[PDB]
Amino acid sequence: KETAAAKFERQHMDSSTSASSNYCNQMMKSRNLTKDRCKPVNTFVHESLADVQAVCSQKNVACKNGQTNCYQSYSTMSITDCRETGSSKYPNCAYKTTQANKHIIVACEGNPYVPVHFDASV
């Protein structure tokens, strides 16, 4: 079974790139986020895996779902938000690529204590 930790790295990690207009169209497809449907919104983090994992030891904040296992990065991180276009129709999923530098909020669980969900950017 794909583990929640591995699923987080597939959905949300892209250390290879520091911060193109095609990027979300390419990445949402290559990371298998358009296989069953167009995933409507998704964020990629352009930091090292160790720096993102380290967020699980940073500022504890409420998750949007009311769970207590979310963490906010003390430093800003390079991210890309992918947002499905009005005109996008499965299977030809189309996205708007937006670069930002924001604090990330991730949910962490397990032993080792690692990110399993991307909750928000602020």
Curated annotation (Swiss-Prot):
UniProt-annotated location(s): Secreted
Expression by tissue: Pancreas.
Enzyme Commission number: 4.6.1.18
Gene Ontology MF term list: lyase activity; nucleic acid binding; ribonuclease A activity; RNA nuclease activity
Glycosylation-annotated residues: 1, 7, 32, 35, 39
Reaction(s) this enzyme catalyzes, per UniProt: an [RNA] containing cytidine + H2O = an [RNA]-3'-cytidine-3'-phosphate + a 5'-hydroxy-ribonucleotide-3'-[RNA]; an [RNA] containing uridine + H2O = an [RNA]-3'-uridine-3'-phosphate + a 5'-hydroxy-ribonucleotide-3'-[RNA]
GO biological process: defense response to Gram-positive bacterium
Cystine pairings recorded for this chain: 24-82, 38-93, 56-108, 63-70
Subunit comment: Interacts with and forms tight 1:1 complexes with RNH1. Dimerization of two such complexes may occur. Interaction with RNH1 inhibits this protein. Monomer.
Name this polypeptide is given: Ribonuclease pancreatic
Native organism: Bos taurus (Bovine)
